[PDB]
Amino acid sequence: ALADRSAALAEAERLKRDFVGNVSYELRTPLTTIIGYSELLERADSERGRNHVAAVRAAATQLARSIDDVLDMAQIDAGEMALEIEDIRVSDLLLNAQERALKDAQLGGVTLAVECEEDVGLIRGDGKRLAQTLDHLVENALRQTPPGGRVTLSARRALGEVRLDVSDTGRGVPFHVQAHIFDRFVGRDRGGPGLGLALVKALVELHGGWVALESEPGNGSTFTCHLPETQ
Amino acid sequence: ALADRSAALAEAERLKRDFVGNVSYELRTPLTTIIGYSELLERADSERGRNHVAAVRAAATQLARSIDDVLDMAQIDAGEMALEIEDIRVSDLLLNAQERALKDAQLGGVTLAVECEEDVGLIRGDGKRLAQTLDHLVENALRQTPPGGRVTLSARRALGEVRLDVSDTGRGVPFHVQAHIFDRFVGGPGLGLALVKALVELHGGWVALESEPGNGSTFTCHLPE
């Protein structure tokens, strides 16, 4: 029918326009920061200059992650992402995520901590995909945490699983967005995670696991990756 | 009701794949360059630092232009770009493109010339989109022209049409790539010439390349009266 064919085309257009509009927002927002701060560098003779460079590098790195997220999410949606399962030492995985984010943490005046015991040992998964999962959770945490705050990376082997936690002393997730926190391009007041948290969920779920958010506006936030043991 | 809705979503997911592909292919080289040179400036005490800034600035401006191209190309592919037809004085259009590119021309040691007769007069079209078309052609010309060379912006009203030419005394395009010169990523930025073709074709026109390998290159916009 005429009305059914019209409604179908309208729905296909709305779903495309929203996707392009969401990806577009993620391209143009870090870009404004890169232009603004690189122009200040051009007209500079230093500590002030260093802060300008750091702001350029952080915005450029965030733009790069958004593009990688769009590509990795499309690969997952097509069912084209297969994991390369191998032995992963959790201790190193946590310390590598801490050193990769250390510069962006000092720029935001935040302390990155690692609280992992020697008894956590080795898990079996995809190193690249688990490193990318932690990276998304740490940068999400740094964006929410104010200067003087703390972001903690912890791991624990208990109840037939390994759980990776990324705690922050930031602003908590308001109740209404807590149910949609792992949805693509979910509207956040402090700053948008884009495809970052949807990717965390998809990557952990590809490992046979699941993700959770424990939050309270005045008591920070905790993101947990529950990874079951393979007997 | 089910087959029509499915075919519509399949077509929209075809558009998505192209957009996502363009985003990845066009933006990642300037981005990596900004990150690498920024990392050097972060761990630096200067003459060397000024070269790092210049590299960050060139990559930043190329990132801005590439993001515009990727977004404009997606809008065109979806059929969501409608032109705002109005009276355009060709003489001003050519001088506007010359003054916007004048700085990048002097940086590359190239001479930017305008050869338009006041007999060309006025044309009908979208001023923003025609200015953007000339900008892409001048950019393309400046990238091909060596220092000491010349890039010319000309216009001519002949045989029931107006033709805008952007000539260059650069390397010249080889005959085998001449037929595919307006194809996306046929070779830096790869949507510029595909955008020129799409914008001129939206104006009811067509584009052409006149090039001799060694002599030069000329890009013409044929806009019918």
Author numbering:
A (entry chain A): 526 to 570, 573 to 758
B (entry chain B): 526 to 570, 573 to 714, 719 to 756
Provide the authors' own sentences about this structure as they appear in the paper.
From these studies, we propose that the DivL pseudokinase has repurposed its catalytic HK fold to function primarily as a sensory module for a phosphorylated RR.
The asymmetric unit contains a DivL dimer, which is consistent with size exclusion chromatography showing dimeric DivL in solution (observed MW = 50±15 kDa, predicted dimer MW = 47.3 kDa). The functionally important residue Tyr550 (colored in yellow in Figure 3A and 3B) is located at the middle of the first DHp helix (α1).
